[PDB]
């Protein structure tokens, strides 16, 4: 249920954590998620990938010492993962990408 840009953004800034429907890539994989098969919804009903650290090696997102960036899939329900991601920092800055991390815009 909580997988939209606004629902997830507002949850991160309030709860300071991703909702219960998010699991990391490693947790998904251990449950049987095979990216090439687009089977996430089959092996982890109702879950989206999220919570993994985003390197930000391209300097597109703002930097700062001790700042860690994390991503979460947005708008996912079934099949292959889409291209919508929410990016959130340790101090709860919220960015969006809809083009597979090519470009970001601030949303909070």
Describe this structure in words.
With about 110 residues, the chain is of the alpha+beta class. The protein has a single domain (about 1-108), classed as Microbial ribonucleases (Nuclear Transport Factor 2, Chain: A, Roll), CATH 3.10.450.30. It is about 20% helix and about 20% strand. A six-stranded mixed beta sheet has the order 1-2-3-4-5-6. Strand 5 and strand 6 (about 105) form a beta hairpin. It is found in: Secreted. It is an enzyme of class 3 (hydrolase). Belongs to the ribonuclease N1/T1 family. GO terms for molecular function: RNA binding; RNA endonuclease activity.
* Structure class: alpha+beta
- Give me the side-by-side strand order of the main sheet: 1-2-3-4-5-6
Q: Mind telling me the C-alpha Rg?
A: 13 Å
Helical residue percent band: 10-25%
Range of strand content: 15-25%
* Main sheet makeup: 6 strands, mixed
- Going by CATH, the homologous superfamily would be Microbial ribonucleases
Q: Please, how many domains?
A: 1
Shape: globular
CATH class: Alpha Beta
**How many helical stretches?**
3
Write the CATH fold name: Nuclear Transport Factor 2, Chain: A
Order of helices and strands: HEHHEEEEE
- The CATH level-2 architecture is identified as Roll
How far do the termini sit from each other?
Answer: 20 Å
Give the strand tally: 6
PDB class: hydrolase
Keywords: microbial ribonuclease, alpha/beta protein, hydrolase
Assembly: monomeric
Entry title: deletion of a buried salt bridge in barnase
């Amino acid at each position: 249920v909580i997988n939209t840009f606004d629902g997830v953004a507002d949850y991160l800034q309030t709860y300071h954590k991703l909702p219960d429907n998010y699991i990391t890539k490693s947790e998904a994989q251990a449950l049987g998620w095979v990216a090439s098969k687009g089977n996430l919804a089959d092996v982890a009903p109702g879950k989206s990938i999220g919570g993994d650290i985003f390197s930000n090696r391209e300097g597109k997102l703002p930097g700062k010492s001790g700042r860690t960036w994390r991503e979460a899939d947005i708008n996912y329900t079934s099949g292959f993962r889409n291209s919508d991601r929410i990016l959130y920092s340790s101090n709860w800055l919220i960015y969006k990408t809809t083009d597979h991390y090519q470009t970001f815009t601030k949303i909070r």
